[PDB]
């Protein structure tokens, strides 16, 4: 098992920039496929970006492509999400999750979850 | 064109804090892997701390935990927070950046260096 | 005629967007091919294809089976430094110590009392990103192969170490061996025999440094 | 990525004794699956031993392109981690590694451990089940990049459910374009074979396609 | 033809004295070439050249890539005896136990309660010079290659063990493989197909045992 | 060193079946070539069946061929002998032995021995 | 990191022979390139002979070539110098040194040094 | 032209010291390897200690630390210093040498053996 | 299980001083009791001085008492003998020996021996 | 955790003797409390004798007391039952069982069981 | 009245100690000086009970912690070596380490006190760990047999002042030392020479000789 804790959320001006962090506590952090997920008010948890244990594979939601960047530091047991050129649509609770199975982007395959961070954008 | 401007150096007592800053100015499309390096008199230039665009950091064994490298991608600035200074940290601090000039047709980088910052740590 | 690619196209997922679209190149024996491009261009995927991990939907690939691959992402197995470097290969002191020198590892290794006999865990959490990257590159260059695929090895290295490694390892130590280097640095591109620039699976440029300079 | 040819091949383990293999003939084209069936003691392993050069033919000729990965009937585990056992001196690629594990039904077992693939094997660390051992041995063999894959009864100590998953996703899907020789006596496996060789007391009782076998 | 060298000359240091001067030989498939000479003659250097660790300044070298090399200097990796013998090579009981027998290791291994599962340190400090040499040779002969380069393996072995190993391993176990054995013993030279005698980088003799006998 | 203990012996009617077991107590069981040997009263120890450490090699005496089967369990440190279609000729003390040297069927090559079990085939 | 102690020195008549030993106390002896160096009265430390960690590479000063032989025993953590056919020129303090860097015959590359042994070759 | 002559043997008490010597005489161009071997009654000949031209030594487990092999390349002599003698050490000690005869055109060796010296250790 | 090599011997005028060293190559040096022994011309090996594993116990021959000093360095695997105010009587071959058993000064209890060093005291 | 295998069963005349053995295959044998249990035809499994992991504690059923002896060899991963002066009452299938819990003689506390051996008297 | 010795004499096999007399009050520091072979260690062994007196009587409370002349280190971590079999208290542990000049050395390591020993330490590091182990044990009497033997004069000064004098200030201590620097801080001084008591008294009494 791994215990996840996100940070970096808050209020931002449109076209802004925000960087989210997620530290994992536990063994074999490199085995887990890390992912960032967002839950919009009223909506379901949608996938944002994923990283393979190695860091070799990175996948992003079509909506965030070219603006968001997912990164990993296995030595620091941390996963990051750099959110550039933010739009009011990105307002949601950002969750960091770990998957013990190789290469899926569906949140159903992610067993370990963090508490989440609220990220608000105003035009 | 593009210039790198270091600031924040000076003469400090041992145990003091110091924040070096280095900003990239000019026609910059993107910047990759900025870092800090140091050269003590007579000795060769070596790394202090390096930072990837995404924010992954590496440190010299001598500075790991004491120094912190950070970057503002919006401001195209790299920072070296130097804590618990030792007289061993006395050197000229150089800033490096892999910059893509707007003029370039492809996403290719060129190595840019700062003029250097003198940091002197006194025992007394 | 060591590495040849002809009208090569491949897909990671059937019916999807091709990761590589109509790729053409010929790398002669002992030459240095630089593979540049934007993030997501298909550079690693091109190397994956040479390795046989990616099958082309169309086109043909020709090369001799002896390949040594250096990942973008460093990996260190449990065991000593020597165990990590020599790996499956037999031990030759000249080759071992020459590779350490070229890969800027001698000073780091000699800093330890146990030297190369220092036990590393999995992932080398004890070592720095640069130390990990150097050990990974050392292991790759210590393997004797006909072709060397070096996917962004200098990614977590400082510019000073990278300069030393590129000059003394990639250029001096591996001078007579065909090698493919994934790099977007002009400093590296000037020393390349041929340059392939990829952008969104497509070949935007293929030719010499002088041809690239004239653009 | 090889051609496997045998022409009128006969061999003996002991000088002047009974031949272990008598007049063996077959041609396996690139990327094809040959199924080697037979009774216990038929000479199946001995045929694979010959391809490996451990058995010299007294008469006949054998041709192949080297770069062969061999999976033993008998699982073997080296001291070290699971990862150490699978990669075994072969350069590490995450995609290839995690794909092989998935195919060989190892992901669930490995993820059950807190240390995952970093769990230490052998007496020192842990004792795995016969099936876990067999899966790790097969994983190691399929992880090795070779032109020819000799899989001698790998499903021997596996349950029929796991064997079905492994055969379909590993032998048939993962290694689809690689030349494979699979020692199996299961019809379920034989239906998916390109060619079938049936051995009985060193002799070739059948050689041909599944349709040819069906017509008997 | 398996291994050929025509007018081969090489230097360790540019502008120095050549380590090997105008070397010529052709070793047919499955033949035993004996490489004799004084200390510093260039024997190891010749094998290094076959490996590609030494690049010729002049001449040409031809062979099939499948080479297994046994060093003059025994090396032991941290791990068990079995781990050391099957150095990343697939395990086959028959081959393993046959190699052990041929290399005079069975008696030594069976002396230990843990047998081949006994843990060794780096350099095999726990074992004798002979035990270390035998494990190194076993590792080399366990590897299935087309060409076997055995550089003075019997150097730290007693004449009784060496006799057993030469007869049952070099001559019987490896009987139909192309082998290059660095030896200066007449006892070994009588069983050679061709003999190369080196002196200060130069070929002083090249031919059969009968030709050597007639001098 | 290995300590061997056999079990499974007794009285049976001809055409019958019996399964003998032999557990080994000691290190590196897999190194040893295990063998079943029978001592007829007023007769020399005769080889019955052998199994290599791996289990890859199994050899039987011509007399027992097709009726007896030798098996191994390295995880349980045991070797078994399934004796089917027994004849009164098979009446002997069955011994279990270990050899540290590779592939010999001669009892002279086996250093470690068990106590033995009497097997009696009547009618 | 390695402590060295030489022995075997003394007085000898010209044309004679002497064998020097040097035991190393410390970890990873095999990593070090061992070397014998001589310091003549009034002169600087001159290189005599060197041996690679493995023992695969042996190099000698032109003056001693053909008369001196360097050997190693990694199991015994010792390095030896067999000095045959001695000339009065060889009178010097013989030092045994270890280098953590690969293949240099320059004493500047050797970090660890022994106490030394006086060797006197009488013309008499 | 070439002869090997052992000396130093005899009857000693247990715990005694003894120095065996073996000199190569005749037309010697050079000697490569030298060694001491022993053969006790009924038992086979085995190594005691071996020495390379340069002086690197190997020992039998039974004698290591107690016995010391040395050589004088000027005198073409090998020596076996036998300390803390045990009754087990009773045997005929043979000397071996890889000798290049002055007649030999190249630096090629031939195996030469001594006649043997008897060493008897009493209790 | 320990190989010993002495050094420091030679010629000295009476009233002089000499320091002998002995390095041990092998495992568990701290277990051994180290001793210096001298063999005069024609005489048996006589005990000179001994040091326990720990270095807690030092014993000397009555003849050398107050002039000779035994020291140990377990980190450097060496034993030393400082011979001050030398008399011509001390002329002998000095041997360094190791004993695997606790507290005996008789050379019969010492299993591992060195080559020895000649010490000659004139005038 | 532990795989058990009994041996030594068979037919004997009353007043006779029989010795049963039970070898355990698995890790931490010394942790287990070993026990011998008998199940007569028509009856439930009854406790016969028990040994603590150490061998320090031995307990016997009142019926077998003074005639049966339980012993252990942790180095050989074996437990033995010496059955002297046998009565026809002792006819049952003798089972060997391991308990990961300290000091219970109730077969309900024993998780790992062997195949059993028939003893006829 | 913590430690008392009355006309005590003993033999190992000449008597190693001849007619020894002394009385050390609670919380006092006794310095035991003498030439090499005087019988200092042997006197401590008698206090332990490892040496039986042929004549005389010894009186004390059983709670003794002994620091050997010869440093010994067990195969575990630094913490394992200092703590030994004693229950762990952070305050006591970190205070002992500070006093015994070990903090700087321990902190030089990445694993700190979790570093595994046979790493070969310096004689000084070994001596400090041995003394730390002895002072970590909570006893009524501390027998410190030449602990500063392989220590530099600067470290020894710091350890003597902050550990022997400050840390153990109210505890009875017997320190085997021949240093005047240490003797000046002693409550009573016993000087031994060839098993005999050559001097017994205060520093002022020693000064007046
Ligand atoms: N193993 C894989 N399986 C499936 N799809 C993959 C795999 N590896 C990469 N891809 C996809 O194909 C694309 C190829 O990207 P690739 O890593 O080859 O580009 P790149 O030039 O290597 O990028 P970078 O500079 O970040 O390394 C990616 O966008 C990714 O989504
Ligand atoms: N290495 C060997 N040396 C000598 N004889 C051998 C060897 N391997 C096998 N044999 C013999 O040859 C026959 C074994 O054939 P083999 O084991 O290849 O059949 P198989 O089809 O693999 O049997 P199984 O289905 O049990 O694996 C037997 O007679 C056996 O004793
Ligand atoms: N890796 C190397 N780099 C530079 N010079 C070398 C190297 N290896 C050997 N030499 C030098 O080249 C020469 C060739 O020596 P080489 O090692 O081939 O000896 P050999 O005679 O073949 O083997 P040996 O000396 O053990 O009998 C020697 O003079 C040696 O100093
Ligand atoms: N365990 C022992 N058994 C027999 N004799 C011993 C023992 N320990 C010491 N001796 C002997 O008793 C004498 C007293 O030595 P001891 O070690 O007690 O002196 P000391 O006062 O402690 O001064 P130092 O610490 O310098 O030795 C020594 O000469 C020694 O040989
Ligand atoms: O997941 C599919 C798998 O297939 C590839 C493509 O060739 O490579 C496999 O092929 C080799 C056989 O040559 C297997 O042994 C290897 O494990 C597979 O990787 C590659 O896309 C994928 O890994
Ligand atoms: O016991 C005999 C042994 O030899 C064979 C011969 O084909 O195979 C060997 O092949 C090479 C020699 O080219 C050896 O290096 C290898 O280790 C052997 O396998 C075979 O019968 C047996 O293994
Ligand atoms: O900070 C002082 C220190 O002293 C105490 C006891 O008073 O602990 C020590 O206890 C005795 C001395 O009284 C010593 O022998 C032992 O080494 C110390 O741990 C306690 O306050 C503090 O730890
Ligand atoms: Mg990539
Ligand atoms: Mg088979
Ligand atoms: Mg390992
Ligand atoms: Mg050589
Ligand atoms: Mg390996
Ligand atoms: Mg003392
Ligand atoms: Mg304890």
Short mmCIF file of N, CA and C in Angstrom, two decimals, chain C residues 18-79:
data_model
loop_
_atom_site.label_atom_id
_atom_site.label_comp_id
_atom_site.label_asym_id
_atom_site.label_seq_id
_atom_site.Cartn_x
_atom_site.Cartn_y
_atom_site.Cartn_z
N UNK C 18 -0.85 7.37 -36.19
CA UNK C 18 0.47 6.72 -36.25
C UNK C 18 1.50 7.50 -35.45
N UNK C 19 2.26 6.78 -34.60
CA UNK C 19 3.28 7.37 -33.75
C UNK C 19 4.46 7.86 -34.60
N UNK C 20 4.70 7.17 -35.73
CA UNK C 20 5.74 7.49 -36.71
C UNK C 20 5.15 7.34 -38.10
N UNK C 21 5.30 8.40 -38.93
CA UNK C 21 4.76 8.49 -40.28
C UNK C 21 5.84 8.70 -41.35
N UNK C 22 5.97 7.70 -42.25
CA UNK C 22 6.90 7.61 -43.39
C UNK C 22 8.32 8.04 -43.03
N UNK C 23 9.00 7.21 -42.21
CA UNK C 23 10.35 7.49 -41.74
C UNK C 23 11.37 6.85 -42.65
N UNK C 24 12.34 7.67 -43.08
CA UNK C 24 13.43 7.28 -43.98
C UNK C 24 14.75 7.83 -43.47
N UNK C 25 15.76 6.95 -43.43
CA UNK C 25 17.14 7.23 -43.04
C UNK C 25 18.06 6.04 -43.25
N UNK C 26 19.35 6.33 -43.49
CA UNK C 26 20.40 5.35 -43.66
C UNK C 26 21.62 5.84 -42.87
N UNK C 27 21.98 5.10 -41.81
CA UNK C 27 23.13 5.41 -40.97
C UNK C 27 24.23 4.42 -41.29
N UNK C 28 25.34 4.92 -41.87
CA UNK C 28 26.50 4.11 -42.25
C UNK C 28 27.24 3.63 -40.99
N UNK C 29 28.08 2.59 -41.14
CA UNK C 29 28.86 2.02 -40.03
C UNK C 29 29.69 3.10 -39.31
N UNK C 30 29.64 3.08 -37.98
CA UNK C 30 30.38 3.99 -37.11
C UNK C 30 29.94 5.45 -37.08
N UNK C 31 28.80 5.78 -37.71
CA UNK C 31 28.27 7.16 -37.75
C UNK C 31 27.42 7.53 -36.51
N UNK C 32 27.26 8.85 -36.27
CA UNK C 32 26.44 9.37 -35.18
C UNK C 32 25.20 10.08 -35.74
N UNK C 33 24.01 9.49 -35.46
CA UNK C 33 22.74 10.08 -35.86
C UNK C 33 22.13 10.77 -34.66
N UNK C 34 21.81 12.05 -34.80
CA UNK C 34 21.16 12.81 -33.74
C UNK C 34 19.67 12.84 -34.02
N UNK C 35 18.86 12.46 -33.03
CA UNK C 35 17.41 12.48 -33.17
C UNK C 35 16.85 13.57 -32.27
N UNK C 36 16.43 14.67 -32.90
CA UNK C 36 15.87 15.84 -32.22
C UNK C 36 14.37 15.91 -32.44
N UNK C 37 13.72 16.77 -31.67
CA UNK C 37 12.28 16.98 -31.77
C UNK C 37 11.63 17.49 -30.50
N UNK C 38 10.36 17.88 -30.63
CA UNK C 38 9.53 18.37 -29.53
C UNK C 38 9.12 17.20 -28.64
N UNK C 39 8.60 17.47 -27.45
CA UNK C 39 8.14 16.41 -26.55
C UNK C 39 6.91 15.72 -27.17
N UNK C 40 6.96 14.40 -27.26
CA UNK C 40 5.90 13.59 -27.86
C UNK C 40 6.03 13.36 -29.35
N UNK C 41 7.15 13.82 -29.96
CA UNK C 41 7.45 13.70 -31.40
C UNK C 41 7.52 12.25 -31.94
N UNK C 42 7.91 11.30 -31.08
CA UNK C 42 8.04 9.89 -31.44
C UNK C 42 9.46 9.36 -31.45
N UNK C 43 10.39 10.11 -30.83
CA UNK C 43 11.82 9.79 -30.75
C UNK C 43 12.08 8.45 -30.04
N UNK C 44 11.57 8.28 -28.81
CA UNK C 44 11.73 7.04 -28.05
C UNK C 44 11.11 5.90 -28.82
N UNK C 45 9.89 6.14 -29.37
CA UNK C 45 9.14 5.19 -30.19
C UNK C 45 9.94 4.70 -31.39
N UNK C 46 10.75 5.59 -32.00
CA UNK C 46 11.62 5.23 -33.12
C UNK C 46 12.69 4.25 -32.65
N UNK C 47 13.26 4.48 -31.45
CA UNK C 47 14.27 3.60 -30.87
C UNK C 47 13.64 2.28 -30.48
N UNK C 48 12.38 2.31 -29.97
CA UNK C 48 11.59 1.13 -29.57
C UNK C 48 11.39 0.21 -30.76
N UNK C 49 11.28 0.81 -31.96
CA UNK C 49 11.07 0.13 -33.22
C UNK C 49 12.33 -0.61 -33.63
N UNK C 50 13.51 0.05 -33.46
CA UNK C 50 14.82 -0.51 -33.78
C UNK C 50 15.06 -1.72 -32.86
N UNK C 51 14.56 -1.64 -31.62
CA UNK C 51 14.66 -2.71 -30.62
C UNK C 51 13.72 -3.86 -30.82
N UNK C 52 12.69 -3.65 -31.63
CA UNK C 52 11.72 -4.68 -31.95
C UNK C 52 10.51 -4.66 -31.06
N UNK C 53 10.47 -3.70 -30.12
CA UNK C 53 9.32 -3.50 -29.25
C UNK C 53 8.19 -2.82 -30.02
N UNK C 54 8.49 -2.19 -31.12
CA UNK C 54 7.42 -1.63 -31.93
C UNK C 54 7.51 -2.21 -33.33
N UNK C 55 6.41 -2.82 -33.78
CA UNK C 55 6.35 -3.43 -35.09
C UNK C 55 5.80 -2.43 -36.11
N UNK C 56 6.47 -2.24 -37.27
CA UNK C 56 5.95 -1.30 -38.26
C UNK C 56 4.73 -1.88 -38.98
N UNK C 57 3.72 -1.03 -39.24
CA UNK C 57 2.52 -1.41 -39.98
C UNK C 57 2.88 -1.48 -41.47
N UNK C 58 3.76 -0.56 -41.91
CA UNK C 58 4.28 -0.42 -43.27
C UNK C 58 5.75 -0.03 -43.23
N UNK C 59 6.49 -0.44 -44.25
CA UNK C 59 7.91 -0.14 -44.37
C UNK C 59 8.83 -1.27 -43.95
N UNK C 60 10.15 -1.04 -44.06
CA UNK C 60 11.17 -2.02 -43.69
C UNK C 60 12.34 -1.42 -42.89
N UNK C 61 12.84 -2.18 -41.89
CA UNK C 61 13.96 -1.81 -41.02
C UNK C 61 15.07 -2.86 -41.15
N UNK C 62 16.31 -2.41 -41.40
CA UNK C 62 17.46 -3.29 -41.55
C UNK C 62 18.60 -2.88 -40.63
N UNK C 63 19.14 -3.86 -39.86
CA UNK C 63 20.29 -3.72 -38.96
C UNK C 63 20.79 -5.07 -38.43
N UNK C 64 22.03 -5.09 -37.89
CA UNK C 64 22.63 -6.25 -37.24
C UNK C 64 22.12 -6.27 -35.78
N UNK C 65 21.71 -7.45 -35.31
CA UNK C 65 21.11 -7.67 -34.00
C UNK C 65 21.78 -7.12 -32.75
N UNK C 66 23.12 -6.88 -32.78
CA UNK C 66 23.87 -6.40 -31.62
C UNK C 66 23.56 -4.93 -31.25
N UNK C 67 22.56 -4.74 -30.36
CA UNK C 67 22.12 -3.43 -29.89
C UNK C 67 22.27 -3.26 -28.39
N UNK C 68 22.73 -2.09 -27.96
CA UNK C 68 22.85 -1.70 -26.54
C UNK C 68 22.05 -0.44 -26.36
N UNK C 69 21.04 -0.51 -25.50
CA UNK C 69 20.13 0.61 -25.30
C UNK C 69 20.24 1.29 -23.95
N UNK C 70 20.37 2.61 -24.00
CA UNK C 70 20.41 3.46 -22.83
C UNK C 70 19.11 4.24 -22.75
N UNK C 71 18.33 3.94 -21.70
CA UNK C 71 17.03 4.53 -21.42
C UNK C 71 17.17 5.99 -20.99
N UNK C 72 16.09 6.75 -21.18
CA UNK C 72 16.00 8.14 -20.73
C UNK C 72 16.00 8.12 -19.19
N UNK C 73 15.35 7.07 -18.64
CA UNK C 73 15.10 6.83 -17.23
C UNK C 73 16.00 5.76 -16.66
N UNK C 74 16.92 6.22 -15.81
CA UNK C 74 17.92 5.42 -15.12
C UNK C 74 17.28 4.33 -14.29
N UNK C 75 17.90 3.16 -14.27
CA UNK C 75 17.48 2.02 -13.49
C UNK C 75 18.71 1.37 -12.88
N UNK C 76 18.64 1.13 -11.59
CA UNK C 76 19.74 0.50 -10.91
C UNK C 76 19.18 -0.72 -10.18
N UNK C 77 19.81 -1.87 -10.40
CA UNK C 77 19.44 -3.14 -9.79
C UNK C 77 20.11 -3.29 -8.42
N UNK C 78 19.56 -4.14 -7.51
CA UNK C 78 20.22 -4.36 -6.22
C UNK C 78 21.55 -5.09 -6.45
N UNK C 79 22.58 -4.58 -5.80
CA UNK C 79 23.93 -5.11 -5.89
C UNK C 79 24.97 -4.01 -5.85
#
